[PDB]
Amino acid sequence: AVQQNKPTRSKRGMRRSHDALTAVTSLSVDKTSGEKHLRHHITADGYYRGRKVIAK
Amino acid sequence: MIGLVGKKVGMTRIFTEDGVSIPVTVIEVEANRVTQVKDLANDGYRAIQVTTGAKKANRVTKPEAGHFAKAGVEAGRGLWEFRLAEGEEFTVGQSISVELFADVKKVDVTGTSKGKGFAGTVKRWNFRTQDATHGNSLSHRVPGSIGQNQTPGKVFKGKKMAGQMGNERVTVQSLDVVRVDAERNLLLVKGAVPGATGSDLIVKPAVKA
Amino acid sequence: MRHRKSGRQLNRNSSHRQAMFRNMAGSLVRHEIIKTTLPKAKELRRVVEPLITLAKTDSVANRRLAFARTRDNEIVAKLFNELGPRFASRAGGYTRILKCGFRAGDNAPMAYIELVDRSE
Amino acid sequence: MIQEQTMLNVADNSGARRVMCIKVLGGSHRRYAGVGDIIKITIKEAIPRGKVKKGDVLKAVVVRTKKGVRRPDGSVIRFDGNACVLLNNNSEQPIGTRIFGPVTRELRSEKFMKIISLAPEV
Amino acid sequence: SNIIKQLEQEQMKQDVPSFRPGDTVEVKVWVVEGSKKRLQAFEGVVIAIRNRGLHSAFTVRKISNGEGVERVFQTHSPVVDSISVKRRGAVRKAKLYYLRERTGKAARIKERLN
RNA sequence: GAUGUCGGCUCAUCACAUCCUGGGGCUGAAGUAGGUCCCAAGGGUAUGGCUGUUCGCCAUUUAAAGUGGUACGCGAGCUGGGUUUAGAACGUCGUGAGACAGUUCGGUCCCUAUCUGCCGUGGGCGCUGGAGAACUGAGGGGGGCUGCUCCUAGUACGAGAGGACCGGAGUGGACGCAUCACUGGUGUUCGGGUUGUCAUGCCAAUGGCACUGCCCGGUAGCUAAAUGCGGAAGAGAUAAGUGCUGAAAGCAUCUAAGCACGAAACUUGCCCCGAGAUGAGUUCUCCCUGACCCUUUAAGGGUCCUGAAGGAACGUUGAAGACGACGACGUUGAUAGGCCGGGUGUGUAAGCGCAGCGAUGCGUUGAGCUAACCGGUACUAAUGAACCGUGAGGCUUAACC
RNA sequence: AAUUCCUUGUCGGGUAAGUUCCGACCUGCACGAAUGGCGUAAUGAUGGCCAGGCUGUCUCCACCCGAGACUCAGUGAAAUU
RNA sequence: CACAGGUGGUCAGGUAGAGAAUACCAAGGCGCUUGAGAGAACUCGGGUGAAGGAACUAGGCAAAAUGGUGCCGUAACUUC
RNA sequence: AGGACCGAACCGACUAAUGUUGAAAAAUUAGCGGAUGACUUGUGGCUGGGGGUGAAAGGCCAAUCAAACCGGGAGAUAGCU
Ligand SMILES: [Mg+2]
Ligand SMILES: [Mg+2]
Ligand SMILES: [Mg+2]
Ligand SMILES: [Mg+2]
Ligand SMILES: [Mg+2]
Ligand SMILES: [Mg+2]
Ligand SMILES: [Mg+2]
Ligand SMILES: [Mg+2]
Ligand SMILES: [Mg+2]
Ligand SMILES: [Mg+2]
Ligand SMILES: [Mg+2]
Ligand SMILES: [Mg+2]
Ligand SMILES: [Mg+2]
Ligand SMILES: [Mg+2]
Ligand SMILES: [Mg+2]
Ligand SMILES: [Mg+2]
Ligand SMILES: [Mg+2]
Ligand SMILES: [Mg+2]
Ligand SMILES: [Mg+2]
Ligand SMILES: [Mg+2]
Ligand SMILES: [Mg+2]
Ligand SMILES: [Mg+2]
Ligand SMILES: [Mg+2]
Ligand SMILES: [Mg+2]
Ligand SMILES: [Mg+2]
Ligand SMILES: [Mg+2]
Ligand SMILES: [Mg+2]
Ligand SMILES: [Mg+2]
Ligand SMILES: [Mg+2]
Ligand SMILES: [Mg+2]
Ligand SMILES: [Mg+2]
Ligand SMILES: [Mg+2]
Ligand SMILES: [Mg+2]
Ligand SMILES: [Mg+2]
Ligand SMILES: [Mg+2]
Ligand SMILES: [Mg+2]
Ligand SMILES: [Mg+2]
Ligand SMILES: [Mg+2]
Ligand SMILES: [Mg+2]
Ligand SMILES: [Mg+2]
Ligand SMILES: [Mg+2]
Ligand SMILES: [Mg+2]
Ligand SMILES: [Mg+2]
Ligand SMILES: [Mg+2]
Ligand SMILES: [Mg+2]
Ligand SMILES: [Mg+2]
Ligand SMILES: [Mg+2]
Ligand SMILES: [Mg+2]
Ligand SMILES: [Mg+2]
Ligand SMILES: [Mg+2]
Ligand SMILES: [Mg+2]
Ligand SMILES: [Mg+2]
Ligand SMILES: [Mg+2]
Ligand SMILES: [Mg+2]
Ligand SMILES: [Mg+2]
Ligand SMILES: [Mg+2]
Ligand SMILES: [Mg+2]
Ligand SMILES: [Mg+2]
């Protein structure tokens, strides 16, 4: 099956009306090192919930 | 003819001395507290709103909490309504126990059936499968034709096709009340009622009888 | 449907899943901390924790049971000489999953799984 | 659960040895016949000089099934083979005079009381 | 569930004899012909046992009148009046469905002389 | 500058000139059973043998096996037996190539769906301050089938043979909905047996591979053959039809005025969806009671303070689920895993001891192990926050205070 | 009849029921003797018919294991219009 | 095309096996240049299935089933 | 001994499913036939277009065959679109 008529830029745009990405609403600050990080994720330096879980 | 709200505990059996095994569903019917009474003058219809169970005060919201506090009852897990018949008067906060069904013989039990998800036509509509052999090309459990030709030139509404099956309200009617055990808040009905174990159930007296 | 079922297929067959979790259980015992995908880490809990509780009572029978599920005597030895005595008083929950972002090659949700008393 | 083409043993002395169900009598589109249900059969094998001859089309009542019967307490009574008792095509009374092997209490009705009496075990 | 198990518990039979697959047992059941109610005996080898509490069952297989008959009894049903072990068999398997394919000698269970 | 063609399969949908069930008039209608016509489309309306067949015939059913329209419905759904390509043959025709007024054996069926339509499932905004919970019912959909037996009663009817209406009860077929307590199937995540071979140093014990190697059982879940329920009663208005009173037309007349009955059709009654019903409804509860500045002076714009009810997000997840969504829970915690006890399943582990030449047997021992189950238990993971959403809510008129 | 239109000829056998099959009959529309006639053991991925076993072919589908399909990240077509 | 295709010769370990079949290994060589989740319909490739057993269908298509070695035994017909 | 038998390599290609914008302009997977012979295969050679070759299908003659391909006559002709 194929289109009998070419779809318009209007129709193209209206289908991508739901393709918009969503930003992370907020980032959690570690209570010890103060780095911002994803919630429930370790920081970039290995801290999580104040404690340093990963040495490197 | 108001009903109670219960919880499906599970299925079991009951042996009679006459050598018969009755298949039964156990329904836990705790006290149903009346949280609101609707009348014609104010709501246009006579009904009672009931609550059952217990909900953690942490999960109840302030709007829900105030609605309960007006009745002076504790927060249950949900709010359900039952339409009052002529000559049935209840008051807010009155507790209604399973012994209301002490003398009713058949009940209707409404629940939310088990969710089967996206089902095919064979499972959702009992569509006969096509041939499993004999040259059938990739069309074993497919739906077959779905219309005629140019004259309809379309598919009629309500055509039986694949989609969500289950997880919907369904009422089973006229189930014998095997036992009404007020002390343990239990209702034993003969047969299987819709829903999984732990699901909510609305039990009313049978309407056909 | 999938009602009440347990276990994760992980896009493998039964033999591959079982063999892989033997390797990952061995790896976690040897290093006490490894980095896998979050789904794979959540399933390793159900393979390693049974193995540690088994190691709490040391016997020839239990050590041959560990060898069957591990296929490495060095792992069996660490489980019975070191990890069993270490967790002797811990009533389950010998592991800790910490989510650690996303893999660069395929954006897989990764996670570190460690023994709760690994320390140093 | 007897259906069309099912080959049954014969539990009577009518002379037939093996019959084949050619119709499950009862209602329309009816699929199976259990113990106590009348079927139309055809004789596929019969003893010489018997009361019935091979190729004969008559009725029969099913008396034993491998599917078995269920009891009001949930018990089951299943047999090793499916067997029937040959009936007169127009009166639906048995044409044999001796019943062999056990039968079940599902036959305890006004129509098959003769089979109950002749059976060696119910 | 604590509600169902308690419910089923009070319905269970209290004195049910111990038996294992391979045991020859005689089961006395009730046949109720209206007013007349009597006992009928069914004796055969136990080939399967389902242990599910109130829903416990067991399958007894006999050769009656040249025909193999299997009967599944619901252990706690009031129909089953009593069960008695006439002979203890020595089998290694929980389910003896392979006996359905064996005839006469070859269908006999050796006796558990212990 | 291509509208695939017979039959079958799957899935249908409508008409009524009705096959069955329902209602009725007439009968050359005693009863039983029919005949014929009228009303009625709610539901239902065979399996096989033969042949590509549709049909047809036959066999055996059923209350009945309706007739037609739908591109002789349905090949971007299947099939490809027939027909109608290329090979070959027979009969036949032709001098022949070849052909059929025939027959016979063999012979590639593509398409990832843009729009409409349809089945499901979300996101946005709206509904006029915001929010949570419960509803009303405009409308829409589903369902609507029936046999046999017994009682009334061997009564009414009939010379007998035979044999009811009306009414009541029981038990089935088919169809549907739900459910897994039972009977079972499956259960490559549980246990065991065993073949070949490789390895763990060897023995013993185990693991890998050979379709899960091959099998024998089997938990939970799912599920049918399993087992529970349904079709209704009733009400309103009627169809054909039957009347009551009653003139026009001193009679008669069911009709003109008036009145009564009358079917599975119709409107309800039963089940489900359902306020986007923009005609956006109702009830109950909750939340927010700050200060200024400017202009063109408006349902105007900005500044500081403030950020609620609630929501979302994230996390642990679920008999919820393609994804979303929906439900549970997040330390004031049993949401998931683990652990502990039980259950269940398999069937008496390993080690040791004894007996035997040995294979093996016996004891320790219903042992060991045991997934989705049950009951528990904070050991692990569910974080303090942050984020969104504000600050009393237009105008007119009326009543009221 | 690889040939028979009438034709599903008729008769027999086989099936509950056989337009196919087997054995016959002869009324050969339109067989026939090296464009061979008739028969024939063995052979055949050859055509028709029947039976035992066997089974998800089917009554009537259920469940399970995998690969896609679905979601996320990366790359990224096509016919047609 | 870094393409399930095609391409002549030589070499020939162990265990089981008649075997260069086949299964498991050696030496040696590889995991096939997208992954990660989820565990719907439907499609593909498989496993098992109550009772029945060709009723399917143009047709037993497909599937299931049979399957080795030794001894015994083995019909019509025959060109022996 | 044998165009003998069963069966790998090897040579084929009967059936089915898949795939049909393919992994592939003819294959894959499971079955299937021959497998000491009219066998199969390597390297080289010969036959040339109304010609070849053909255990004969109008088969094959470089993915093309009831008359190959390439250049030319050539802007053949086209009452047709
Ligand atoms: Mg998009
Ligand atoms: Mg579900
Ligand atoms: Mg195809
Ligand atoms: Mg297919
Ligand atoms: Mg769970
Ligand atoms: Mg994948
Ligand atoms: Mg394997
Ligand atoms: Mg065109
Ligand atoms: Mg009419
Ligand atoms: Mg009439
Ligand atoms: Mg109708
Ligand atoms: Mg109606
Ligand atoms: Mg029609
Ligand atoms: Mg047509
Ligand atoms: Mg097609
Ligand atoms: Mg079409
Ligand atoms: Mg089309
Ligand atoms: Mg298609
Ligand atoms: Mg054809
Ligand atoms: Mg013609
Ligand atoms: Mg369009
Ligand atoms: Mg069950
Ligand atoms: Mg259960
Ligand atoms: Mg299994
Ligand atoms: Mg099960
Ligand atoms: Mg050894
Ligand atoms: Mg290997
Ligand atoms: Mg009716
Ligand atoms: Mg804010
Ligand atoms: Mg939070
Ligand atoms: Mg031992
Ligand atoms: Mg045990
Ligand atoms: Mg917090
Ligand atoms: Mg001729
Ligand atoms: Mg001559
Ligand atoms: Mg000649
Ligand atoms: Mg010749
Ligand atoms: Mg040949
Ligand atoms: Mg051939
Ligand atoms: Mg032949
Ligand atoms: Mg992508
Ligand atoms: Mg590559
Ligand atoms: Mg290659
Ligand atoms: Mg080669
Ligand atoms: Mg998914
Ligand atoms: Mg799958
Ligand atoms: Mg089966
Ligand atoms: Mg079977
Ligand atoms: Mg047939
Ligand atoms: Mg048919
Ligand atoms: Mg075949
Ligand atoms: Mg040869
Ligand atoms: Mg092949
Ligand atoms: Mg050969
Ligand atoms: Mg030709
Ligand atoms: Mg060529
Ligand atoms: Mg030419
Ligand atoms: Mg010229």
Which domains are seen in chain D, by residue range? Answer: 1-122 (2.40.150.20)
How buried is residue C17: exposed, middle or buried, by Cβ count under 10 Å (0-12/13-18/19+)? Answer: middle
Please name the residue that has the structure tokens 């006469």: E104
First to last CA, chain E: 39
What's at A9, amino acid-wise?
R
CA-based nearest residue to E60, from E11, E90, E19: E19
For domain C13-116, give its CATH number from 3.90.1030.10, 3.30.1300.10, 3.40.109.10, 3.50.50.60.
3.90.1030.10
DSSP state at residue C43: H
Residue B186 contacts E where some CB pair is shorter than 8 Å: yes
3-class DSSP string for D48-101? CCCCCCCCCEEEEEEEECCCCEECCCCCEEEECCCEEEEECCCCCCECCCCECC
Task: Give the span between the Cα atoms of C111 and E48, in whole angstroms.
Answer: 48
Sequence-ordered list of residues with C-beta below 8 angstroms from that of C51, at least 6 positions apart, any chain: C25, C29, C66, C69, C70, C79
Task: Give the span between the Cα atoms of D72 and E32, in whole angstroms.
Answer: 12
- Token pair belonging to E63: 């050769």
| Residue A15, min C-alpha distance to chain C (Å) | 26
What's at B188, amino acid-wise?
L
Restricting to B residues 21-40, those with a Cβ less than 8 Å away from any Cβ of D are 21
Residue C68's alpha-carbon distances to C75, C93, D72, in angstroms, are: 11, 23, 49
How crowded is residue C35: how many other Cβ atoms within 10 Å of its Cβ?
15
8 A C-beta contact, residue E91 and residue E21: yes
8 A C-beta contact, residue B75 and residue B60: yes
Residue D19's alpha-carbon distances to A22, D36, D53, D55, D100, in angstroms, are: 74, 17, 11, 9, 16
Phi, psi (degrees; rounded to nearest 5) at B199: -80, 160
Report, in angstroms and rounded to the nearest whole number, the Rg of chain E calculated over CA atoms. 16
- Token pair belonging to B122: 């064979």
Q: Are strands D7-10 and D83-87 parallel, antiparallel or unpaired?
A: parallel
Task: Give the span between the Cα atoms of C70 and C55, in whole angstroms.
Answer: 12
Chain A residues lying within 8 Å of C99, measured CB to CB? 38, 40-42
8 A C-beta contact, residue B46 and residue B81: no
Q: To what resolution in angstroms was this structure determined?
A: 2.7
Please name the residue that has the structure tokens 């050590």: C63
8 A C-beta contact, residue A35 and residue A29: yes
In E1-114, the DSSP E strands lie at 24-33, 36-50, 57-64, 67-74, 80-87
Please name the residue that has the structure tokens 């629940």: B111
8 A C-beta contact, residue D83 and residue D77: no
DSSP state at residue D2: B
Residue B114 contacts C where some CB pair is shorter than 8 Å: yes
Torsion of Cα atoms, E2 then E5 then E10 then E15, to 10°: -130
Q: B80 by DSSP, 3-state: which?
A: strand
Domains of chain E: which residue ranges? 1-113
- Token pair belonging to A12: 């193209």
8 A C-beta contact, residue E21 and residue E48: yes
- Token pair belonging to B51: 């609550």
Torsion of Cα atoms, E105 then E109 then E111 then E114, to 10°: 160
- Token pair belonging to B33: 């507290």
8 A C-beta contact, residue E51 and residue E72: no
Inter-chain contact B15–D74, Cβ cutoff 8 Å? Answer: no
CA-based nearest residue to B76, from B7, B24, B22: B7
8 A C-beta contact, residue A55 and residue A43: no
Domains of chain B: which residue ranges? 1-209
* B132 CB less than 7 Å from any atom of strand I: no
Chain E residues lying within 8 Å of D84, measured CB to CB? none
| Residue E48, min C-alpha distance to chain D (Å) | 13
Domains of chain C: which residue ranges? 13-116
Sequence-ordered list of residues with C-beta below 8 angstroms from that of A43, at least 6 positions apart, any chain: A30, A33, A35, A36, A37
Experimental approach: cryo-EM
Please name the residue that has the structure tokens 């005060």: B57
Strand order in D69-70's β-sheet? D69-70, D76-79, E67-74, E57-64, E36-50, E24-33, E80-87
8 A C-beta contact, residue E35 and residue E29: no
* B126 CB less than 7 Å from any atom of strand I: no
- Token pair belonging to D76: 């089951």
Task: Give the span between the Cα atoms of E94 and E87, in whole angstroms.
Answer: 17
Residue B103's alpha-carbon distances to B32, B181, C38, C118, in angstroms, are: 18, 12, 57, 65
CA-to-C1' span, D68 to F233 (A) = 38
